[PDB]
Amino acid sequence: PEPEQVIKNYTEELKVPPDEDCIICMEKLSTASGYSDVTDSKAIGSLAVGHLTKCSHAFHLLCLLAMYCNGNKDGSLQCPSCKTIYGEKTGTQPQGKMEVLRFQMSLPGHEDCGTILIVYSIPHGIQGPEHPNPGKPFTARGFPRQCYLPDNAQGRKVLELLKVAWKRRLIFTVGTSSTTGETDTVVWNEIHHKTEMDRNITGHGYPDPNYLQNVLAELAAQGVTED
Ligand SMILES: [Zn+2]
Ligand SMILES: [Zn+2]
Known part of the structure; x- marks a missing residue:
């Protein structure tokens, strides 16, 4: 799956952003994603916010996308606050x-x-x-x-x-x-x-x-x- 579809698959968007901080970028959820200056995307803007669908922790969707793109892109996501895993986490082990x-x-x-x-x-x-x-x-x-x-x-x-x-x-x-x-x-x-x-x-x-x-x-x- 494409990176942006992973983020959307595991988040429920929030109509109105809460006051708390996104702990990925440490900016308020009501302000633009702190990584908006180095992360580009198609369907996720710098203001979009959602919560993960199992642990209800909230983030800028563009910060989740940047996090996901810094790891290996296997279609799984891990909540940076509580470490809950979405999908099947895999790794980069070479053949052996x-x-x-x-x-x-x-x-x-x-x-x-x-x-x-x-x-x-x-x-x-x-x-x-x-x-x-x-x-x-x-x-x-x-x-x-x-x-x-x-x-x-x-x-x-x-x-x-x-x-x-x-x-x-x-x-x-x-x-x-x-x-x-x-x-x-x-x-x-x-x-x-x-x-x-x-x-x-x-x-x-x-x-x-x-x-x-x-x-x-x-x-x-x-x-x-x-x-
Ligand atoms: Zn953020
Ligand atoms: Zn969580």
């Missing part, structure tokens, strides 16, 4: 593969069950239209990347949700490495994984009693919920 293995040995802190191994393999390539620099190379460092879950009821639920996030292209993105500063490289995208069975190697791994709770919250923040 995701392999799942299991073994009977226990992770530290999960002596009562076996272990799930997830192996992600993403090669280098050419950036697509959704990426920072379309048509330019991107690198991919340190693949295959191996990740571990306990093979209990909660870990198996995380596994199934990770498969959804993978299908929605949400696990990796192309950006700059927080570790090395390198730009235009494949990096993790907001869903943290355990890459060490033993946290003594790097400081991060198992045991970690809060990990499954925390990764479930990260999946949910990206619209990947138990439903």
Whole structure:
């Protein structure tokens, strides 16, 4: 869908604008969109105002359009105030593969069950239209990347949700490495994984009693919920 149709699809226009601020541009809703000076459109003027259809938060429609055009344009929208997701949120994960293995040995802190191994393999390539620099190379460092879950009821639920996030292209993105500063490289995208069975190697791994709770919250923040 066209960007302006996304905004209209998920908003109900307000006849008279309230006094409160648009928190995207921090101008009153009754005045022109604060991003009217750098955002052009066809069917959305600088005065148009609406509220999202599920959380009733209100914005200049032209600010919502500018927000949407700064992200990847997959037809989904996320409310900047309450983070409610409209449509199916997807991401810019490059092509690769995701392999799942299991073994009977226990992770530290999960002596009562076996272990799930997830192996992600993403090669280098050419950036697509959704990426920072379309048509330019991107690198991919340190693949295959191996990740571990306990093979209990909660870990198996995380596994199934990770498969959804993978299908929605949400696990990796192309950006700059927080570790090395390198730009235009494949990096993790907001869903943290355990890459060490033993946290003594790097400081991060198992045991970690809060990990499954925390990764479930990260999946949910990206619209990947138990439903
Ligand atoms: Zn605004
Ligand atoms: Zn909202």
